[PDB]
Amino acid sequence: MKICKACSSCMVRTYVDGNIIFRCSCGESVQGDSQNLLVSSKVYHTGEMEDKYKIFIKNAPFDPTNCQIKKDCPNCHLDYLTQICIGSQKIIILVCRCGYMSNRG
């Protein structure tokens, strides 16, 4: 995302000819070096189990409706933990109100 320093407008990319030169509707150009060459990308089985459920995992020990199991918490030694199942991979996560997160999630 390139924004015009004067117009604060989105600039087209305009790959001409051997380089990348951004152009605004105001006629300004800023060009681009090295790190602007990424045209498009796609990563498979990524963006899942980190960004989709971060808030849900954080709030899970405080959710009354989450299922809980009898398992000792390593940190605060509470006799019960909150059991969490996410994804078509069925990843089981145990979280506690003390912040213990089972290093998974």
Q: Which two tokens stand for residue 12?
A: 């087209």
Residues 82/95, Cβ–Cβ less than 8 Å: yes
Residues 16/22, Cβ–Cβ less than 8 Å: no
**24 near Zn ion, judged by CB under 5 A:** yes
- Residue 12 carries which DSSP code? B
**28 near another protein, judged by CB under 8 A:** yes
Closer residue to another protein, CB minimum distance, 17 or 51: 51
Among 14, 19, 29, 59, binds another protein (CB under 8 A): 29
Contact residues toward Zn ion (CB under 5 A) are 4, 7, 9, 24, 26, 28, 73, 75-76, 78, 96, 98, 100
